[PDB]
Design a protein around this ligand. Structure first.
Ligand code: HEM
Ligand code: HEM
Ligand code: HEM
Ligand code: HEM
Ligand SMILES: *[C@@H]1CC(=O)N(C)C1=O
Ligand SMILES: *[C@@H]1CC(=O)N(C)C1=O
Ligand SMILES: *[C@H]1CC(=O)N(C)C1=O
Ligand SMILES: *[C@H]1CC(=O)N(C)C1=O
Ligand SMILES: [Zn+2]
Ligand SMILES: [Zn+2]
Ligand SMILES: [Zn+2]
Ligand SMILES: [Zn+2]
Ligand SMILES: [Zn+2]
Lengths: 106, 106, 106, 106
């Protein structure tokens, strides 16, 4: 799929987690973020369109995705453990990653 | 790509790493494995086509990939650190992950 | 050592990364953060002394430490890859972890 | 404890996981492994008695503990999710880590 709406998927579901009442809602939302993050692994962003995929800045662009994927993995465990406020915070802390990569590659 | 290809991608580069003389070959190989593992995230394996995408086996199916992704991530760091032998061992260790998921959903 | 003293160690070093010129200052600093973070895995914080180690809340208190350990582990790879500004950024992010646990347990 | 005592803690708890019947015994055991792994972080092995604890040779010895800590954190998540067989498998796999570090530093 596209990076935007891979990014939209991530962003919508992030708010869903923010407004959630319950675990079920969070589990479903995190799973959707997992799909969009993994599916975004391929993409070449607009800033980086001519740079080589095997390029030092593509390597750093993807790394940020490993970070995100790892942070979503763990938050899903917390959700699965029905530690909701805890999943919710891990999601909030997961924001930096979004931010660090935005500042640099967008 | 096809679940099948991705598995072939992982497999093939696994041997490339087992065989490698220097860092560059290991890095390139790992990176390919990363692409295949991430791309495979959304696949529904043949043994589970009946069972829903939100089902318990599917979550456990997907979890296994989270583990692979994390292990590839770290090995690439070791490769980047020119610690080749160590990278090659981290690869060999991974094989368990491949095998835990094969025993179960294969 | 002391929980207080480890916190100090984490902080002091955190700043040393902030004012870094080179990777070596960063690697050394992170390695110490690692020692402090691991060494504090044990500690019972003041607000929790009445609570059993095996309490749901000393399970979350410790969880936070795993997050920090993981984050440092990864920043050290970045540093070891002489990816210095990048390592610096990973350090900036991991503050969230310091703050999530402060707001709750401190 | 001294490296030896933590290694025994690790070893003993691993059989306990091995023979377990219910989640509770697995979690209690993994939590102990966590303490022993974190508490070992600082130990110098004996074949490194001389080598300064900023050698890259120390750095590599500890790296292995970052790997163990991470694999324990997870297997605890699995256990906390009452996914007991899955937790048990995650412990068996994580030995490779035990085995790798024994081979090199022991
Ligand atoms: C973190 C979980 C995260 C969020 C949230 C997020 C959101 C987001 C939006 C809303 C856009 C705009 C898309 C549009 O078409 O309107 C956007 C764009 C980009 N993102 Fe992002 N994004 C998050 C995480 C990450 C991470 C970890 C990275 C890189 C490692 C990343 C990258 C990008 C890039 C590059 C863009 C530019 C897209 C474009 O304008 O074409 N995002 N993101
Ligand atoms: C580890 C990196 C890994 C390797 C290597 C690997 C290889 C592999 C092969 C060669 C096949 C056969 C496909 C073919 O037709 O040639 C195969 C098949 C499946 N596997 Fe696999 N695989 C690795 C890892 C993993 C992981 C982490 C999982 C589960 C999370 C997994 C699972 C599967 C499944 C399902 C198949 C069947 C594919 C199909 O025919 O649809 N593997 N793998
Ligand atoms: C991140 C790596 C991190 C930093 C930095 C940090 C700093 C810190 C400070 C500055 C203090 C006290 C400072 C003051 O009094 O002005 C302090 C003390 C406590 N901390 Fe902390 N800390 C970091 C990480 C973490 C994490 C991840 C946790 C929880 C898992 C945590 C918790 C605490 C607690 C409790 C205290 C109070 C200690 C006491 O007085 O006994 N910190 N830390
Ligand atoms: C994995 C969790 C793990 C286990 C289990 C383990 C066990 C273990 C034993 C049983 C000994 C010998 C003690 C006896 O009386 O039988 C031993 C010794 C050492 N270990 Fe270990 N070990 C595990 C993991 C690891 C890891 C990941 C490392 C390094 C990163 C490591 C290191 C060592 C070292 C060094 C020794 C020598 C100390 C000694 O017993 O003389 N172990 N371990
Ligand atoms: C998580 C989901 C559920 O039903 N419980 C009781 C949990 O703890
Ligand atoms: C460091 C290690 C290596 O193999 N190369 C090519 C480096 O630059
Ligand atoms: C370590 C130092 C450096 O310049 N590189 C590229 C490293 O991996
Ligand atoms: C499922 C697994 C567990 O430990 N509890 C308390 C559950 O409800
Ligand atoms: Zn769109
Ligand atoms: Zn966790
Ligand atoms: Zn590592
Ligand atoms: Zn990394
Ligand atoms: Zn997990």
């Amino acid at each position: 799929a596209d990076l935007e709406d891979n990014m939209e998927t991530l962003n919508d579901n992030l708010k869903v987690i923010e407004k959630a009442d319950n675990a079920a809602q969070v589990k479903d939302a995190l799973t959707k973020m997992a799909a969009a993050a993994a599916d975004a692994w391929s993409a070449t962003p607009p800033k980086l369109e001519d740079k080589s995929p095997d390029s030092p800045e593509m390597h750093d662009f993807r790394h940020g995705f490993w970070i995100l994927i790892g942070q979503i993995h763990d938050a899903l465990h917390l959700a699965n453990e029905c530690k909701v406020k805890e999943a919710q915070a891990a999601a909030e802390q997961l924001k930096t990653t979004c931010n660090a990569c935005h500042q640099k590659y967008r």
